[PDB]
Amino acid sequence: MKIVLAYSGGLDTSIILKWLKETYRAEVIAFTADIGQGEEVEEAREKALRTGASKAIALDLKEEFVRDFVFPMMRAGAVYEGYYLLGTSIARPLIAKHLVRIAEEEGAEAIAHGATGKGNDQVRFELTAYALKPDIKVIAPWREWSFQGRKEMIAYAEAHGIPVPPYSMDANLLHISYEGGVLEDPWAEPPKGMFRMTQDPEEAPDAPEYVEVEFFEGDPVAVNGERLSPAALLQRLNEIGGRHGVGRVDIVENRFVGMKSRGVYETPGGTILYHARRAVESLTLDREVLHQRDMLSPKYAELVYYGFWYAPEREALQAYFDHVARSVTGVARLKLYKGNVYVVGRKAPKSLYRQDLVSFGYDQKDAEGFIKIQALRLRVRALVER
Template sequence: MKKEKVVLAYSGGLDTSVILKWLENTYQYEVIAVCVDVGQEDDFAAVKQKALSTGAIKAYILDVKEEFVTDYIYPTLKAGAVYEDDYLLGTSFARPLIAKKLVEIAEKEGAIAIAHGATGKGNDQVRFEASIKALNPYIKIIAPWRVWDLKSREDCVDYALKNNIPIPVTKKDIYSRDSNIWHISHEGGNLENPWNEHDENIYKMSVAPEKAPDTPAYVEVQFSHGIPVAIDGFQYSPVELVEKLNKIGGAHGIGIIDIVENRLVGMKSRGVYETPGGTILYEAHKSLEKLTLDRATMNFKKNIAEKYAQLVYDGLWFTPLKEALDQFVDSTQQYVTGIVKLKLYKGTCTAVASASPYSLYNEEFVTFGEDDVYNQKDAEGFINLFALPLTIRSLMKYDKDQQKKINKNKQVI
């Protein structure tokens, strides 16, 4: 009897290595391992070989870095979406792309199910499964962490040793990490106690800010319609541009955050994130928008950015609302073109200069010196109209107070 096939989101790490063998042992499935390259620095030849040697009947390595940057990172950057004021959504927007590729392979291979290694406590289970359901609701989803008898990463280590599965962690190095071209996250281990200061030795993309150069560095980022296209006058492909800024930012300790965040499933979690290049791009993009967007659009776009971040964090990438917000965001970016100069110094990234052919800043109007374009007397009429509701309210209150005084005086007489 022919065995049924399952597609596994595979990284070669502890969890997915154990899951591959567990799917085979528990359900007798033929496992097709799919490793989606979104920029994590892995030996993909070794990952593929490990999947096959662990029992997979086939292993795919899919390089989607270009698609990741252009179709997932850049739209979120243009929206200015930041979750809870800090998190630049590095893991969040990688999940819908990975899910999309898993569905494509499952359809191609005739697999009945997709399996993933997200835990029952985290956000990724929602991101994977909401995306899969949006793209193909007929594919079965298997989430081993919600059904098997293994209760911890330590149990996974034991299972791997028992089944002769080589693993990249030990019980001493138990951090859960997720990395891609945009960031790396660190969770678990001693980070689970928020009173523990994190150890700088966990950094992978950055140096500690205290160990960054004592001399500040400057970098210029050029944008075209809200999309970064050049660094210091040199044009780069999307992937090259992000990688270049990661090196520049990482060398100066840019983009390291240690946060407690609210997970979608209702609990708080603590993580350390490194996003060096992304932090530079967000700061540059925000600065250029301040130069080129009018006040009303900027203020309204902040509301859109917050909602956009919530959708991305919650795994609702493939939704009508997300598509509608993209249309709004794109309309705001038609004049977000120009150059921003940033100063990098020991973990800080500050925009210090900006220029755009669509700048709304007009020196002739705002100068404190003499000018011929602005009649200051015009401000009086503007203020009278602007403050008219306040004036009317104050007059009403004044009249009532006066009437009360008159009535009080009558009673005394």
């Protein structure tokens, strides 16, 4: 039986690559995707044919990632439990998508990933796979093998002949994530030097830096006047924001599978994009529309976090968020300074702001009528209390 493996190029997926050959004695098609992890994905591809893959595939998926996943999510203003911008959550559906596609092209019966049985990724990968190909066979080695510890895994590796080697990490164009190890103690500050994508606030420039982001119908299309494709734009903003230490979050989140987990996230580009978007929305979105959208964002966020991307509830909400987002067109101007992102200006060709309505269609005495009617039910209530 052929099996398509989400191959990362590291120890575990290498061990998994042989484990699959050994255990199932199946033909293994490896798949590595470049989503901005900062790894020469082609090496991964080499190491896979080298580990025994009957075929290895690598694809530059950066643009599709930002265009078809990050952007639609940002359009919805998705924030999980107040701070998490879903860096890892949104990338998983993209990977599983290709896994299933490849499996259908290779006539492969199953797909495999090395997400552990303790996290959210296994759900994201599998819900995606089952949603796209209900008959797909899934193999999650971490839930099926006997290994107990890394000593045993290192051992097993040293065996078969797989090169071997404080916290776990997941990185992509949207963010870099840290959790586990020394991070597992909620009262322990993260260790100095851990952050990779963002410069340390204290080592951030002494002079603030201004940046402008242009949005067109809900999506960012240019930075400082330079049009940039989805991936190139997130990249650019990561560079600009990174140098200033922007986008660091430290939270104890609730995992879908039931337990709390301490995670640390750095999302420089995305964090600038989040505040810039709300800046443009502040002029282009109607009051009542904004208030409704915001009360739905959290639900959409958990859908993403839990793994329900290619799910009807999420696609339905997407219709609402996309409708609203289509009006978000304009430019936000932000000030970057030692870890902070400050909105200092915004403009829109179709801005709903009118200074003439605030400076000292509006008539003061109308306010009295407004107030009286609004107060009626309250006045009746009081009178009944007598």
